[PDB]
Nucleic acid binder design. Structure first.
Ligand SMILES: [Mg+2]
Ligand SMILES: [Mg+2]
Ligand SMILES: [Mg+2]
Ligand SMILES: [Mg+2]
Ligand SMILES: [Mg+2]
Ligand SMILES: [Mg+2]
Ligand SMILES: [Mg+2]
Ligand SMILES: [Mg+2]
Ligand SMILES: [Mg+2]
Ligand SMILES: [Mg+2]
Ligand SMILES: [Mg+2]
Ligand SMILES: [Mg+2]
Ligand SMILES: [Mg+2]
Ligand SMILES: [Mg+2]
Ligand SMILES: [Mg+2]
Ligand SMILES: [Mg+2]
Ligand SMILES: [Mg+2]
Ligand SMILES: [Mg+2]
Lengths: 170, 244, 137, 178
RNA sequence: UCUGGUUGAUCCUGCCAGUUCAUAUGCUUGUCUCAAAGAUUAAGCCAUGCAUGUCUAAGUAUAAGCAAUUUAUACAGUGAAACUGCGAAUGGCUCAUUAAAUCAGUUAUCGUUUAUUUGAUAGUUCCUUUACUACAUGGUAUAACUGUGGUAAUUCUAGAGCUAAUACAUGCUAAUCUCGACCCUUUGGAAGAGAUGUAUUUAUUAGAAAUGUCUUCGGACUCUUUGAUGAUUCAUAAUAACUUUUCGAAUCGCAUGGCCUUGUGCUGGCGAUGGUUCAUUCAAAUUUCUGCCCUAUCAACUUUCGAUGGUAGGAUAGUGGCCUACCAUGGUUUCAACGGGUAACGGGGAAUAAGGGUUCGAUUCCGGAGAGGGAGCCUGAGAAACGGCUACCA
RNA sequence: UUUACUUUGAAAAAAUUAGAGUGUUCAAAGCAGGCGGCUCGAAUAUAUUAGCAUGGAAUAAUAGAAUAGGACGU
């Protein structure tokens, strides 16, 4: 029943348009995939052409990147803490793009200790806020993927001005 | 419609084919291929309406299924195969070689060439770009992808393709004083020399062409095809040499 | 610059905190072509505008039009008025007509009601906007 | 902004090309000469004067055997309005520049083209436009008429056998009311 | 539009009388060529029949099919049925709806999908259970067929037994390239030091005075090293991970050549069908500007239930209020918005006219829309399909 | 200076319209090739507006640091 046509809308003057034709398949939409934290549940969607999309109905892991350190580790997602579009997505723990989530810090901590031999010193220095999070056990991350489109929940660790901004907003 | 069309009315067919309006209700619809629909001559039209070797479509099919027809050195068995500009058509049983070139009227001429000239064709460079693994290539006006081109080759230049190997033997840059052939518009079929290329950014470039009689005309750059240096084309030209 | 619920940034422009070569955050920009000068308030600015022709993800291609600003009451878009004479052959005479074009204006530009702008065509920005201010006068 | 400074590069191109083999000369000279003549389309008078001096120097480097090619190229590029007046001003300038280098009968081949330009700009439509009071312009090519000087340059070079080329348009003009 | 009257005879203004196309219909109707066939604003309703199927040498035959044969030893000629594949989204019909909508001309995709056609394109050597199928894997399997059946009835089908693949699902098999000490001085050999697919998602990165010396007089000695557009976060490349994750030939015809260390050894021809990505072609969806009949006794409209715009997300093939959340209060309008009427599909065109105009255009070509009326979908490259399916109204 | 306006050039499918050739027996039509190089043959044209390129001296708008100024303070 979802359509993306612009003919049902009013004209820019405010005029009510009449129906030109019946709805076309080339202008459809589908139900949202309200991805939630849990055991991996993904189903394929056959899209226009032979192409396929992946619907993440449920997901609890993702490949998250430490951009300053130039690394990526697979990690468990703990939960959604903040979302800039709608707070009910945070209330229900719904994973979409741009959501701020908390991720397990363990693989990043292990990589840091292995690479720098520390729990050289100048290079090992990182931001105070990120290190405080490492002490806590969870890291704030932003989801960069579109879970309902690609089936992946990839993201990156918040740093610098973005981290300060989201620490204020929390 | 709900998908691609498969028919063509005779009145809606390209005018330059010279189809009788009362012969039937339909014209041969060119199939997908190297050349665009309106800019192509399907083999049925060539074999029946131009050469008269076949009296109807069924005999054209009989000729094609004997594997008697080669287009650019390869056997084609499709009746509506879209042969086009600069294509070489070979009939071995008749000892005949043809190159598809428009005459001054704007219609493809029945132009017989020698077996030495039948071995190559000219392609206008439509695109030069890097493919995967960083291998450069050129796309020509007939849809040929040719890898490892000479670095000097640019868009709007012409390359000489050897049909047996499909490789570039030589090329001609697009520049003032080069010999050009008009392949579109109302000057379709005329030959001249480039005088000036008027450039407009974000718009259509224009080329001034001077013929051997010193008449000048302006054409869009899309309709211009470099064929040689003035007084020395790379291909045999039809009767009239593109005058008037 | 950060007056929205989400953090505003240029996508895929990375400011490395570990390095700290320069105080100013790295800023990407382009020149839009067609002889339109990129203003320095765009190059050295701090604004984030995804629909800016110099620092956003939009390109200028298509028709280049000119008009007079008649409204600036909405955020980052204006309304220009383009006037022309339409010919009536029966009376062999003209009549004044106009049209209103909604245009996107980057915050690298300052426009008042009355000045003349050159606008370039871009992909649909909103329901009605298909143009982006490329020069003010 | 730098177009006037770069025009003498065309003079450098003619010199290096003329050192090449004859086949290469025929393959590069027409491109170089044609490109210069298109800059005369420009609406800038200062640029048109910069083109004109480079054409003059190239004409000395070349001979009169290349004069026919240049003039026919010039007639092809300049065809409407003030371009007609630019054509005759530039044609005289090349003749004026080549005055020393020219030998006897060098202009015989191009004599017919020159006189058509000369007569059109004294008695033809171009000549009338120069005499029109309604025609207010600051372009020097149009306010200035050089046809008389070109006629003197031509008569100094033409072989007496071809001197009937000059007299014939005069006779045709004299038959009609004047 | 002209002609004759109104006076004893003229001029002007008036009066009187006569002066193709469209629809319906009347009578007549031999010969040649040629050609069309709407209409109750009833896009009202339809009995019957037909209008969409399709096989090459080249996907699958132990039909208990037919016919052959040197009378058959896996098969092999021809071939119903069924599986598989492709098509059925073209064509044909009609003009109901529709008034910046369709449409015409002119643009854009640096904003997206695209079966098919045409052209290009994929040696990844190795990496412990080698406890090893690649001289080639499974039923995780069935149709046709055999047999037992239900129903008044339909292109309805159930239980049971079989058996194939280009169906379905699995899964393998001593390379190439950089430098190169040392010899040797070339047609060089090579101790050794190194390197190694695609596809998916994200993050990050790149994509800008040698004017000398020697020489055999040639040439050598050191350096260069992406491209394109008006314009890009473009093409392309690199690093690290990621994936219910792809692909990287378990396919088919014809034929029987070449090497030998003579083994049914190794090798090998012309084709078919597939397959990754790019380009191309046939297309599609959106899109920029200008242009429509009557109505002002329709002057304000849109915005509560998206109207104009911002930020973010969701969805889409993809841009976009297309939808959602939170924000602003915008957007159009006497240069006529909005509302109403239309015996309104638009155009190429047809008629008339001296010219300007005016009328007609369902109707051979192009574009759009529909299939009694609303709504929704499966399959598929492509359909909101109707000679496809599901509901509700009639 | 810019615009309006005006000139030229592309563009505006074919069919239809006008026009050229051709003894379909004539005609309404249809149609593009003949002789053994012949300088033989549709040569063709047509469209108000909108957008694109281009030459313009008038006309109508539109512009100018156009023919401006030079005295004081601690
Ligand atoms: Mg159809
Ligand atoms: Mg043209
Ligand atoms: Mg008889
Ligand atoms: Mg086959
Ligand atoms: Mg209405
Ligand atoms: Mg097919
Ligand atoms: Mg292919
Ligand atoms: Mg890229
Ligand atoms: Mg968005
Ligand atoms: Mg909302
Ligand atoms: Mg109607
Ligand atoms: Mg139709
Ligand atoms: Mg339909
Ligand atoms: Mg009905
Ligand atoms: Mg299908
Ligand atoms: Mg339906
Ligand atoms: Mg039916
Ligand atoms: Mg149908």
């Amino acid at each position: 029943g979802i359509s993306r046509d612009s003919r049902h809308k009013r004209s820019a003057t405010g005029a009510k348009r009449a129906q030109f034709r019946k709805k076309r398949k080339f202008e459809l939409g589908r139900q949202p995939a309200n991805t939630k934290i849990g055991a991996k549940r993904i189903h394929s969607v056959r899209t226009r052409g032979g192409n396929k999309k992946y619907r993440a109905l449920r997901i609890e892991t993702g490949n998250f990147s430490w951009a300053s350190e130039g690394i990526s580790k697979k990690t468990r997602i703990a939960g959604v803490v903040y979302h800039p579009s709608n707070n009910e997505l945070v209330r229900t723990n719904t994973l979409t793009k741009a959501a701020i989530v908390q991720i397990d810090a363990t693989p990043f901590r292990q990589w840091f200790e292995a690479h720098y031999g520390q729990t050289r010193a100048a290079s090992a220095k990182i931001e105070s806020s990120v290190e405080s999070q490492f002490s806590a056990g969870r890291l704030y991350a932003c989801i960069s993927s579109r879970p309902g489109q690609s089936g992946r929940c990839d993201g990156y660790i918040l740093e610098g001005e973005e981290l300060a901004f989201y620490l204020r907003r929390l | 419609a709900r998908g691609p069309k498969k028919h063509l009315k005779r009145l809606a067919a390209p005018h330059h084919w010279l189809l009788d309006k009362l012969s039937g209700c339909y014209a041969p619809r060119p199939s997908a291929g190297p050349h665009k629909l309106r800019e192509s001559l399907p083999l049925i039209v060539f074999l029946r309406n131009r050469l008269k070797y076949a009296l109807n479509g069924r005999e054209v099919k009989a000729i094609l299924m004997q594997r008697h027809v080669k287009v650019d050195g390869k056997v084609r068995t499709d009746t509506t195969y879209p042969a086009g500009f600069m294509d070489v058509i070979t009939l071995d049983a008749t000892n005949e070689n043809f190159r598809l070139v428009y005459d001054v009227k704007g219609r493809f001429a029945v132009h017989r060439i020698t077996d030495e000239e039948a071995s190559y064709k000219l392609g206008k460079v439509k695109k030069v770009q890097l493919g995967k693994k960083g291998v450069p290539y050129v796309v020509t006006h007939d849809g040929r992808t040719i890898r490892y081109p000479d670095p000097n080759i640019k868009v709007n230049d012409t390359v000489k393709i050897d049909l047996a190997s499909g490789k570039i033997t030589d090329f001609i840059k697009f520049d003032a004083g080069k010999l050009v052939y008009v392949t579109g518009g109302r000057n379709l079929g005329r030959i001249g020399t480039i005088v000036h290329k008027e450039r407009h950014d974000g718009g259509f470039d224009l080329v001034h062409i001077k013929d051997s009689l010193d008449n000048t005309f302006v054409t869009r750059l899309n309709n211009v095809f470099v064929i040689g240096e003035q007084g020395k084309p790379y291909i045999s030209l039809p009767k009239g040499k593109g005058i008037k | 610059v950060q007056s929205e619920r989400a953090f505003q940034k240029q996508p895929h422009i990375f400011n490395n905190p570990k390095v700290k070569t320069s105080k100013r955050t790295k800023r990407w920009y382009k020149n839009a072509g067609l002889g339109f000068k990129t203003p320095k308030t765009a190059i050295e600015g701090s604004y984030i505008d995804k629909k800016c022709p110099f620092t956003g993800l939009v390109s200028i291609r298509g028709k280049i039009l000119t008009g007079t600003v008649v409204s600036t009451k909405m955020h980052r878009t204006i309304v220009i008025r383009r006037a022309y004479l339409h010919y009536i052959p029966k009376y062999n005479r003209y009549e004044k007509r106009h049209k209103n074009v909604p245009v996107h204006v980057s915050p690298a530009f300052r426009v008042q009601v009355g000045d003349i702008v050159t606008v370039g065509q871009c992909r649909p920005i909103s329901k009605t906007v298909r143009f982006n201010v490329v020069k003010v006068s | 902004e730098t177009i006037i400074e770069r025009m003498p590069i065309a003079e450098a191109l003619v010199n290096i090309v003329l050192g090449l083999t004859n086949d290469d000369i025929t393959n590069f000279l027409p491109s170089i000469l044609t490109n210069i003549c298109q800059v005369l389309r420009s609406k800038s008078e200062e640029l048109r004067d910069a083109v004109r001096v480079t054409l003059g120097k190239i004409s000395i480097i070349l001979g009169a055997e290349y004069l026919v090619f240049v003039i026919k190229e010039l007639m092809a590029t300049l065809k409407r309005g003030s371009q007609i007046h630019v054509l005759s001003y530039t044609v005289h300038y090349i003749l004026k520049s080549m005055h020393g280098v020219l030998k006897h009968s060098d202009l015989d081949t191009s004599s017919s083209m020159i006189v058509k330009i000369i007569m059109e700009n004294i008695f033809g439509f171009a000549g009338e436009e120069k005499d029109s009071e309604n025609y207010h312009t600051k372009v020097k090519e149009i306010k200035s008429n050089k046809s008389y000087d070109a006629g003197e340059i031509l008569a100094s070079n033409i072989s007496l056998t071809e001197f009937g080329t000059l007299l014939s348009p005069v006779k045709a003009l004299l038959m009609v009311r004047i």
